[PDB]
Amino acid sequence: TATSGSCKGRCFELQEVGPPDCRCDNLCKSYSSCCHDFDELCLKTARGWECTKDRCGEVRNEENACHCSEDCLSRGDCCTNYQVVCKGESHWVDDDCEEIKVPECPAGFVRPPLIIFSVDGFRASYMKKGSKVMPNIEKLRSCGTHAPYMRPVYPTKTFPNLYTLATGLYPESHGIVGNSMYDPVFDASFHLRGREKFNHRWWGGQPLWITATKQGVRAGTFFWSVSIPHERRILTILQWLSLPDNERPSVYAFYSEQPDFSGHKYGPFGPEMTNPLREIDKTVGQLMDGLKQLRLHRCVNVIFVGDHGMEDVTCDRTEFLSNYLTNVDDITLVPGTLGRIRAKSINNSKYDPKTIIAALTCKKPDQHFKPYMKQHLPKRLHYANNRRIEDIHLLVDRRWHVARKPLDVYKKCFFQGDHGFDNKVNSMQTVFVGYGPTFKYRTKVPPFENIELYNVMCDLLGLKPAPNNGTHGSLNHLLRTNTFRPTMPDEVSRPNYPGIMYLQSEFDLGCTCDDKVENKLEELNKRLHTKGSTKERHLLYGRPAVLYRTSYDILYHTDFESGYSEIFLMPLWTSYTISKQAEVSSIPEHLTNCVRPDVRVSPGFSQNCLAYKNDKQMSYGFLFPPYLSSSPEAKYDAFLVTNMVPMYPAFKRVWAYFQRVLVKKYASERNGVNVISGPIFDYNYDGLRDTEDEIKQYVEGSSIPVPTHYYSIITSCLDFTQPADKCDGPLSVSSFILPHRPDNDESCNSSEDESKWVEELMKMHTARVRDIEHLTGLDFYRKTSRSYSEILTLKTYLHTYESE
Numbered sequence: 001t002a003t004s005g006s007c008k009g010r011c012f013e014l015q016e017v018g019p020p021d022c023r024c025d026n027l028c029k030s031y032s033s034c035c036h037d038f039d040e041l042c043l044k045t046a047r048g049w050e051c052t053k054d055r056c057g058e059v060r061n062e063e064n065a066c067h068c069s070e071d072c073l074s075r076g077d078c079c080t081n082y083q084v085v086c087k088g089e090s091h092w093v094d095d096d097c098e099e100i101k102v103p104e105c106p107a108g109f110v111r112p113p114l115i116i117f118s119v120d121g122f123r124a125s126y127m128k129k130g131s132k133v134m135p136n137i138e139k140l141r142s143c144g145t146h147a148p149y150m151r152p153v154y155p156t157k158t159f160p161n162l163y164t165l166a167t168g169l170y171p172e173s174h175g176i177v178g179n180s181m182y183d184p185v186f187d188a189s190f191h192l193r194g195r196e197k198f199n200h201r202w203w204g205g206q207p208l209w210i211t212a213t214k215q216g217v218r219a220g221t222f223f224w225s226v227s228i229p230h231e232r233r234i235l236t237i238l239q240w241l242s243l244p245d246n247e248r249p250s251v252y253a254f255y256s257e258q259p260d261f262s263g264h265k266y267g268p269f270g271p272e273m274t275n276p277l278r279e280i281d282k283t284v285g286q287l288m289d290g291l292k293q294l295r296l297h298r299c300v301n302v303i304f305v306g307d308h309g310m311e312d313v314t315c316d317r318t319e320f321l322s323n324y325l326t327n328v329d330d331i332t333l334v335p336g337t338l339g340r341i342r343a344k345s346i347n348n349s350k351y352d353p354k355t356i357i358a359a360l361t362c363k364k365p366d367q368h369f370k371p372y373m374k375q376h377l378p379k380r381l382h383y384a385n386n387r388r389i390e391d392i393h394l395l396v397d398r399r400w401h402v403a404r405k406p407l408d409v410y411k412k413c414f415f416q417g418d419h420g421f422d423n424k425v426n427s428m429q430t431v432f433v434g435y436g437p438t439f440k441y442r443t444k445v446p447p448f449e450n451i452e453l454y455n456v457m458c459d460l461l462g463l464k465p466a467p468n469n470g471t472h473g474s475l476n477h478l479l480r481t482n483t484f485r486p487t488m489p490d491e492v493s494r495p496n497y498p499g500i501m502y503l504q505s506e507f508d509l510g511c512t513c514d515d516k517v518e519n520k521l522e523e524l525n526k527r528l529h530t531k532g533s534t535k536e537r538h539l540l541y542g543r544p545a546v547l548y549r550t551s552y553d554i555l556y557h558t559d560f561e562s563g564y565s566e567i568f569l570m571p572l573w574t575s576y577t578i579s580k581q582a583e584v585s586s587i588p589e590h591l592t593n594c595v596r597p598d599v600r601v602s603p604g605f606s607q608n609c610l611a612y613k614n615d616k617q618m619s620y621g622f623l624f625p626p627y628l629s630s631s632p633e634a635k636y637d638a639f640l641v642t643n644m645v646p647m648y649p650a651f652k653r654v655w656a657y658f659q660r661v662l663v664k665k666y667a668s669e670r671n672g673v674n675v676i677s678g679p680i681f682d683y684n685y686d687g688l689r690d691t692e693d694e695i696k697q698y699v700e701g702s703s704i705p706v707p708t709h710y711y712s713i714i715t716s717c718l719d720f721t722q723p724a725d726k727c728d729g730p731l732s733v734s735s736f737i738l739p740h741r742p743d744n745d746e747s748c749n750s751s752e753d754e755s756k757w758v759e760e761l762m763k764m765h766t767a768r769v770r771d772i773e774h775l776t777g778l779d780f781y782r783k784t785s786r787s788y789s790e791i792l793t794l795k796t797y798l799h800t801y802e803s804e
């Protein structure tokens with residue numbers, strides 16, 4: 001860099017110039033590339049950040065940081081409080097808030113600008129707990145649209161989350177999977193410190209500023225060099241807002257290192273935390289006062305958003321891999337509030353991940369982390385499908401750290417706070433407030449995930465979003481206008497409706513049943529149950545649509561309905577309703593090993609019992625539980641070969657408990673439940689439905705594919721005074737994606753009775769319906785009385801099982 005060029009008239013230039021020409025942009029300090037005069041011209045500090053009575057009407061001294069002269073408004077370089085001190089105006093916070101029904105912008109403005117005020121480590125509970133010291137932020141919150149909290153992505157670190165906010169993508173898809181990373185294809189590393197993080201090969205997807213530029217919307221630069229003070233960042237944004245209509249950007253970003261920086265040292269609620277919250281609020285006040293001076297305070301949309309929260313973590317709460325592993329020098333550990341382990345050297349052929357996992361599995365009674373092969377991580381975390389995420393992962397308990405050896409903790413107590421844990425943990429939750437003409441007025445919205453904002457910021461700017469992991473329309477309820485009006489995806493495969501086409505004797509399945517037991521009253525009645533008379537009861541929200549090319553059958557029964565796949569030889573889904581009044585019955589002795597041919601489905605597209613006998617590892621279970629049959633005659637339907645699915649005996653303990661106990665418990669507590677359950681196949685852990693040829697495992701000697709997971713979607717009336725089957729209003733849902741595993745090594749207390757561990761496992765693997773759609777290629781809730789945007793919101797809902 002030949003720094004002999006100048007920054008005269010180029011301060012915070014929006015277009016970056018190429019080396020070895022010197023730079024004057026808001027990033028030049030980070031690349032050590034600024035022109036010699038950058039500090040003098042662009043980082044002026046003289047006389048402070050606020051006008052004073054004496055300075056009012058002064059003679060323009062260009063050296064001053066901000067100006068109090070009469071001409072300053074037209075130059076667009078006044079101090080933010082100029083009109084308060086020198087013209088008797090009020091601070092924006094002291095004004096009563098008034099609905100902004102339409103953009104009230106200066107002439108020339110083609111759209112409301114968007115300003116994103118991002119705050120590092122701004123824990124959700126600070127909005128309540130620090131409300132007395134943050135009046136500007138509290139005005140934004142209460143007069144704008146706010147959520148009680150926003151759910152970050154895993155890992156709940158700064159870079160993964162800022163780039164998820166920028167792109168709408170899960171870290172596995174955008175590539176910033178941690179604050180620290182190794183890419184084995186590049187043979188490069190990425191760190192917070194240093195120069196390799198500036199290379200564009202690390203950064204996938206399309207962040208907002210590129211989406212804007214590519215579509216003719218001009219963007220301020222989002223990144224700010226750490227040395228540039230906050231007051232200067234604000235003044236720069238206000239200066240840009242004063243630019244000519246053909247140069248002025250439409251989207252802007254501010255970033256604060258606080259309260260994260262203090263929160264690390266002092267803990268999330270340390271008494272030292274009050275001051276950082278005062279300064280952030282003061283900065284917001286400066287922005288809104290500056291906007292008001294420029295008559296932009298009822299034109300611009302302001303987003304106040306955080307990347308993650310902050311938890312209490314100290315050095316004494318550190319698990320050391322040295323107290324579990326003998327071989328601790330043959331591994332590399334990405335440490336901290338999560339753990340990622342790989343081999344220290346790829347030439348070491350004695351390195352076995354299986355032995356390492358086993359040595360970290362349930363070894364101490366209070367063990368404050370749990371090891372996982374990455375594909376066994378809860379699917380809600382979507383943290384697997386990247387070569388940068390190590391095969392071995394440690395999910396660390398909230399409040400704790402994992403390190404390799406004790407020397408790493410005392411040769412690196414200092415910190416009292418940290419983050420990075422599971423994104424369902426309360427302490428990791430962060431904030432969202434939207435304020436402006438396109439946002440709603442004094443509106444609370446439910447919690448939502450940060451992956452959803454990319455779309456909304458595209459809507460706010462009139463942009464078409466790049467393909468991302470948001471569900472577009474699920475956050476339309478934040479907006480007065482500029483809503484995106486989505487359509488249901490078209491069904492690709494239509495079902496067959498097979499009647500009775502096969503004789504018992506055509507089947508040679510090795511299956512037996514004790515069912516040779518014999519009337520016109522109840523033969524016409526059961527006929528109509530196989531044509532779909534109780535389908536109104538058991539399929540409450542329409543049949544799910546299959547959104548890919550396949551061959552399947554709708555099978556009707558008294559207690560349940562299924563979409564049976566001829567390719568996978570099992571239901572893709574099974575739907576049934578259990579009212580509050582329904583009764584659990586036992587599986588009778590004569591039917592214990594009963595499997596019956598389904599006369600509507602060919603032998604060739606059926607499973608068989610012989611495969612299950614020959615497979616000593618694999619057993620089988622049922623999607624509609626026999627336990628909940630409506631009558632002894634109806635119970636025979638639950639033993640059909642078309643209701644059967646492959647299950648490991650270790651997983652059957654879980655499934656049986658869910659089906660026998662929990663389904664009824666949920667129907668009691670929620671006033672009936674509709675359950676839709678089924679298999680999932682994700683052998684390549686991309687979070688997406690596997691095609692046939694991706695299946696790595698079959699029931700031995702057969703074409704019966706083995707699920708990697710089993711799902712259920714449990715729906716009822718949000719108004720729980722109405723029964724699930726007759727609900728007039730909004731729905732309530734919770735779902736799960738249980739891993740289909742041949743042991744229960746994940747559950748350290750699995751030797752005990754299922755009532756001590758099963759429900760706990762299901763909670764860990766809670767899921768959004770949208771997760772299940774991605775994984776199955778199905779589309780649920782097709783026929784309701786509710787708006788589609790409300791259904792989209794419901795589909796992205798996650799039941800977290802955390803307290804308030």
Ligand SMILES: *[C@@H]1O[C@H](CO)[C@@H](O[C@@H]2O[C@H](CO)[C@@H](O[C@@H]3O[C@H](CO[C@H]4O[C@H](CO)[C@@H](O)[C@H](O[C@H]5O[C@H](CO)[C@@H](O)[C@H](O)[C@@H]5O[C@H]5O[C@H](CO)[C@@H](O)[C@H](O)[C@@H]5O)[C@@H]4O)[C@@H](O)[C@H](O[C@H]4O[C@H](CO)[C@@H](O)[C@H](O)[C@@H]4O[C@H]4O[C@H](CO)[C@@H](O)[C@H](O)[C@@H]4O)[C@@H]3O)[C@H](O)[C@H]2NC(C)=O)[C@H](O)[C@H]1NC(C)=O
Nearest residue numbers: 172173174175203204205385386387467468469686687774
């Ligand atoms: C979350 O949202 C995202 C975004 O919508 C979803 O991710 C998408 O999923 C698609 C389906 O899996 C995927 O589509 C593929 O695109 C391939 C081309 O990809 C490049 O171009 C895109 C578009 O600009 C770009 O975004 C991509 O960037 C990825 O890769 C670079 C690294 O080079 C990273 O910088 C970046 O972070 C991103 O990485 C992530 O995605 C890749 C996969 O693309 C993962 O491997 C990484 O781990 C990481 O997660 C790329 O630059 C295209 O080549 C594919 O086509 C193959 O498959 C089709 C199937 O129809 C087949 O018919 C074709 O023949 C073709 O196969 C050929 O190659 C095979 C393998 O080499 C071989 O086996 C065959 O024999 C053939 O030769 C495919 O169309 C799309 O790229 C990603 N997009 C992103 C941004 O990730 C994600 O699904 C959502 N998540 C959930 C849960 O819903």
Ligand SMILES: Cc1nnn(Cc2cc(C(F)(F)F)ccc2CCC(=O)N2CC3=C(C2)CN(C(=O)c2ncc(S(N)(=O)=O)cc2F)C3)n1
Nearest residue numbers: 116118157158159162163165166222223224253255257260
């Ligand atoms: C990363 C990343 N991806 N995209 N962006 C730009 C961006 C997007 C938005 C958005 F909200 F709109 F998306 C909104 C704003 C932006 C601009 C982001 C920006 O100016 N910076 C991010 C950052 C800077 C400067 C310096 N950083 C640290 O050194 C740092 N590191 C680790 C931790 S911690 N607490 O985790 O240990 C804390 C830290 F402060 C991170 N930054």
Ligand SMILES: [Ca+2]
Nearest residue numbers: 682688689690
């Ligand atoms: Ca898959």
Ligand SMILES: [Cl-]
Nearest residue numbers: 157178179180
């Ligand atoms: Cl990390």
Ligand code: NA
Nearest residue numbers: 612615616618
């Ligand atoms: Na078996």
Ligand code: NA
Nearest residue numbers: 744745747750
């Ligand atoms: Na166990």
